[PDB]
């Protein structure tokens, strides 16, 4: 996301900027034959993201390809429209930039900045766990990003290391807006990733942006422990644990970290941090963040825990290898009406 150029004033301008783009989204800003597709960077439950080279500029990008028929099969039409409409409208240092979008007969395409440092996930699993200062550095960026997104009436709904990328300065970029939604009241969809679901999602109650603050508790736990607070071999066993909501902490967790996590991983919405009278400030002013200079994080002035190794603009060494598949495009348009606004 673009680098930094009162907080109430900042957020007011940010909302004006967002709403102009929300109300009149960008469409059709590239086409498939403007890019050479090189290699898959990642797949998720819905799309495939490829490293591509834009021919006329020589620039590399990360192209998310969604098969329209798969989107329909998995009941993701509205979610995918949400994803693109929101991502084209947002602007924050720790959000991946959508550079182009377009569609063809078969697929939807979201061409992002290529964030070359890899998923946080891979680094996390390899090293085992992050130190508290390292975890805190990443967590601060998510706190600020959620303050931004929630101010726009957005809920993010898929926070996990697989959807967080490390950039060339060692800062985070959030990707995968697939479950992001602009909502002023509560919402009901069962979506996310099992380990990160708040209890109120699992219990079908109706929920709001507090589920993102829960998920931040899960992320901070997982970064600092190396495993999630609620794990099992199958999702249903995870849900039981979440709803039990007893949390146990590693021996090495600081008292401050445990206290913060008890307040984020809080089943009682009247007590969950992020969800109280003082909003995000209960988190920012928590003892675990006492060392965090919030403005310096926003300005990317804090020294990063590590800068990924980068050997040229098309280097993918920080990403796992994936099986490749042909990108088919039918001579017949699929799902034209459904995706008219994309």
């Amino acid at each position: 996301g673009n680098a930094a150029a009162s907080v109430k004033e900042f957020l007011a301008k940010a909302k004006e900027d967002f709403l102009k783009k929300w109300e009149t989204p960008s469409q059709n800003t590239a086409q498939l034959d403007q890019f050479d597709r090189i290699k898959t960077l990642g797949t998720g439950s819905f799309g495939r993201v490829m490293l591509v080279k834009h021919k006329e500029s020589g620039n590399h990008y990360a192209m998310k390809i969604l098969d329209k028929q798969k989107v329909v099969k998995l009941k993701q039409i509205e979610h995918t429209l949400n994803e693109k409409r929101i991502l084209q409208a947002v602007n924050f240092p720790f959000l991946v930039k959508l550079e182009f979008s377009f569609k063809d007969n078969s697929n939807l395409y979201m061409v992002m900045e290529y964030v070359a440092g890899g998923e946080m996930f891979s680094h996390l699993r390899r090293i085992g766990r992050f130190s508290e200062p390292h975890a805190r550095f990443y967590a601060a960026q998510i706190v600020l990003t959620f303050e931004y997104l929630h101010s726009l009436d957005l809920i993010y709904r898929d926070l996990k290391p697989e959807n967080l990328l490390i950039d060339q300065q060692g800062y985070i970029q959030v990707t995968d807006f697939g479950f992001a939604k602009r909502v002023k009241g509560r919402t009901w969809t069962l979506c996310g990733t099992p380990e990160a679901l708040a209890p109120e999602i699992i219990l079908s109650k109706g929920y709001n942006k507090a589920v993102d603050w829960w998920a931040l508790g899960v992320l901070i736990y997982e970064m600092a422990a190396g495993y999630p607070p609620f794990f099992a071999d199958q999702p249903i066993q995870i849900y039981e644990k979440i709803v039990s909501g007893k949390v146990r902490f590693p021996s090495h967790f600081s008292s401050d970290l445990k206290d913060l996590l008890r307040n984020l991983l809080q089943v009682d919405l009247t007590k969950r941090f992020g969800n109280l009278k003082n909003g995000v400030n209960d988190i920012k002013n928590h003892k675990w963040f006492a060392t965090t200079d919030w403005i310096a994080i926003y300005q990317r002035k804090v020294e990063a825990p590590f800068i990924p190794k980068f050997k040229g603009p098309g280097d993918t060494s920080n990403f796992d290898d994936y099986e490749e598949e042909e990108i088919r495009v039918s001579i017949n348009e699929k799902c034209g009406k459904e995706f008219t606004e994309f």
């Binding site: 819905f46 969809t189 990733t193 679901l197």
Partner: peptide
């Protein structure tokens, strides 16, 4: 250990979203 139990589990790799 909790770590050993996690590592021996089936969910140490990249996790899929759930929906529907």
């Amino acid at each position: 250990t909790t770590y050993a139990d996690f590592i021996a589990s089936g969910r140490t790799g990249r996790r899929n979203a759930i929906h529907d």
